[PDB]
Amino acid sequence: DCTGSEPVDAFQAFSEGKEAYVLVRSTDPKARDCLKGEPAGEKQDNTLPVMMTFKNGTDWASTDWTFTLDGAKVTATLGNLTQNREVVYDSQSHHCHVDKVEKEVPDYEMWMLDAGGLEVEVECCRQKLEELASGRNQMYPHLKDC
Ligand SMILES: CCCCCC/C=C\CCCCCCCC(=O)O
């Protein structure tokens, strides 16, 4: 309140591969509609296969990514694409987390359990996202007729 999980560990922030997370806030104007990530297999050493589901226009679509975990950092790969993230905030019970997408102009994202989370924890994630966004525009992918 609002001291979440310290230090942040990406695998624990993903409930150790036991849950799916939904994208609820993003500073990226290209954030995919209804974006959701769910584990597609067990963690092999430091590698976790993840299926991302979202709406591509009116139809549902899916992409199979490979996540490499390193402390709070996550390197996601698909074909020739590579996305580097750092989980900068993770709530007390891993009900939600805030990521920093590492690039020329870094983006900030809020992810929460598709199964639902405690209001107090969800509020802490929202607060942390608002602080890091600092006057930038925000997208709401979960409201896109999901
Ligand atoms: C197991 C919980 C994972 C939830 C956290 C998801 C983190 C990063 C997801 C980035 C995936 C990139 C989506 C881009 C859309 C695409 O082209 O497939």
Residue numbers in the entry: 23 to 168
Task: Provide excerpts from the study.
cis-palmitoleic acid (C16H30O2) was the dominant (∼64%) fatty acid in the binding pocket of bOmCI, with various other C16–C18 linear fatty acids present in lower proportions. All ligands fit into the L-shaped pocket, with the kink at position C12 of LTB4, ricinoleic acid, and palmitoleic acid. Palmitoleic acid lacks the -OH group at this position, and in that complex the same OmCI residues coordinate a water molecule instead. The ligands are also of different lengths (C16, C18, and C20, respectively, for palmitoleic acid, ricinoleic acid, and LTB4); LTB4 fills the pocket completely, whereas the yOmCI-ricinoleic acid and bOmCI-palmitoleic acid complexes show a water molecule filling the bottom of the pocket. The three ligands all bind with their carboxylic acid head at the solvent-exposed brim of the OmCI pocket, hydrogen bonding to the side chains of Arg-54, Thr-85, and Trp-87. The hydrophobic side chains of Phe-36, Tyr-43, Leu-57, Gly-59, Pro-61, Leu-70, Val-72, Met-74, Phe-76, Trp-87, Phe-89, Arg-107, and Trp-133 contact the hydrophobic body of all three ligands. The main ligand-dependent structural difference with respect to the yOmCI-ricinoleic acid crystal structure is the position of the loop βB-βC (residues 61–70), which pushes in/out to accommodate a smaller/larger ligand. This movement is mediated by Pro-61, the residue at the bottom of the ligand pocket. The other main locus of structural variability in the bOmCI and yOmCI structures is the conformation of the βH-α3 loop (amino acids 132–142), shown previously to be required for C5 inhibition, which in both complexes of bOmCI swings inward, with the concomitant flip of the side chain of His-117. However, the chemical nature of the ligand in the pocket bears no relationship to the conformation of the βH-α3 loop, as the loop was observed in both conformations in different copies of the yOmCI-ricinoleic acid complex.
OmCI is a bifunctional protein derived from blood-feeding ticks that specifically prevents complement (C)-mediated C5 activation and also sequesters leukotriene B4 (LTB4) within an internal binding pocket. The 17-kDa lipocalin Ornithodoros moubata complement inhibitor OmCI, originally isolated from an ectoparasitic tick (Acari), is a bifunctional protein that may have such therapeutic advantages. By binding directly to C5 in the vicinity of the C5-C345C domain OmCI prevents cleavage of C5 by the C5 complement convertases, thereby preventing release of anaphylatoxin C5a and formation of the terminal 5b-9 C complex (TCC). We describe two crystal structures of bacterially expressed OmCI: one binding a C16 fatty acid and the other binding LTB4 (C20).
